[PDB]
Write a protein that binds this ligand. Structure first.
Ligand SMILES: *[Se]c1ccccc1C(=O)Nc1ccccc1OC
Length: 124
């Protein structure tokens, strides 16, 4: 198993730029991994988003400097209209992504247990 709870990963979800996030357990399947292999991630930032991500869309987070290669490869690897599916980041989205980056670098400087304490979403 490539990742475990509290791992920081870049996650690619169709329709969004490559986004900092954390491996975490799904609130109602109480699992962080499964075979549909997928992993469950919380996306960092002010929106409390979460998703199941195929491992091929998951890259271990080292830091913001990985963003350019991720973005450029993903549009490089596209089978023309597929390459076009690579759209701009508005000012509002960029600030939301910059927020998520700031959380992810904080999280990366604590331990897995401190960042699990600080960043795990609270559910009903
Ligand atoms: Se990853 C990146 C870097 C710089 C500009 C745009 C992107 C990007 O991937 N944008 C994408 C890709 C797919 C859907 C939407 C969207 O931008 C919102």
């Amino acid at each position: 198993l490539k990742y475990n709870v509290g791992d920081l990963v870049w996650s690619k979800v169709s329709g969004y730029p490559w986004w900092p996030c954390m491996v975490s357990a799904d609130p109602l399947l109480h699992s962080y991994t499964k075979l549909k292999r997928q992993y469950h991630v919380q996306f960092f930032g002010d929106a409390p988003e979460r998703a199941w991500i195929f491992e091929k869309s998951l890259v271990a987070f080292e830091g913001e400097g990985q963003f350019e290669k991720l973005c450029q490869e993903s549009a490089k690897q596209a089978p023309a209209e597929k390459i076009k599916l690579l759209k701009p980041i508005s000012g509002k989205l960029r600030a939301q992504w910059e927020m998520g980056i700031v959380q992810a670098e904080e999280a990366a400087s604590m331990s897995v247990e401190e960042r699990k304490a600080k960043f795990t979403f609270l559910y009903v």
